């Protein structure tokens, strides 16, 4: 088929963060305005939604990871991805 | 395969609204700062794009569902979703 | 299947550009606050992301069009739309 992708930036450079999920697994590549590199996400699913907000100068970021009906919240808020409180359903 | 979702976010606390596309049903996800809790979005589409925006404190949402090669916009504008102006062509 | 799409919005007008992948070509729909039209862009793709940016109320765009396990970045910054940076490694 072909890999998916999300999008997300912020400020004014900007930072730009993209996540590929591709062949069950979502890797991202990064932008803080002079190249491209990887970033630390690493994150097991088929398929990825991504929104982010600053708080001050500080980003945080959710990727919504998802494997069959399985969507698992993976969490950026400074120092190092946790996993969310996000559930499906209840 | 896999659901597919989209995800967007607004103001400080955040607020942010998970949409996943399951077998040709769209539902919503909330969280506004305590848990999550499922949302009034609920309509037919096997994919889900969504942006928004703050008039204020207000948050206009748009959410394109797509079935087949139909997408139909719905909006969030402080009062219940209502179908809105998009069209793919023309 | 279905269609894919992407959608982003800026301002408070808003103006809105969605996105949609639809067998192997990515169209654009704009509105800025009366209608709906056809934008510039037209790339090869499968599936899309976006995300955008204002400096001041110039806008800058980045759309993520992928094709097997190629992702090309597009890059929208007033004049046109040409190829951007972005690659998937190294």
Excluded: M
């Excluded at 963060?17 to 990064?30: H, L, M, Q």
């Excluded at 500080?58 to 991805?81: K, L, Q």
Aim: aromatic share 14%.
């Amino acid at each position: 088929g072909s890999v998916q992708t999300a999008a997300t930036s912020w400020g004014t450079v900007p930072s730009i963060r993209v996540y590929t999920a591709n062949n069950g697994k979502i890797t991202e590549r990064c932008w803080d305005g002079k190249g491209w590199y990887t970033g630390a996400f690493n994150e097991p699913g088929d398929n990825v939604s991504v929104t982010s907000w600053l708080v001050g100068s500080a980003i945080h970021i959710r990727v919504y990871a998802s494997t069959g009906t399985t969507t698992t919240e993976w969490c950026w808020d400074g120092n190092g991805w946790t996993k969310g409180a996000y559930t499906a359903t209840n």
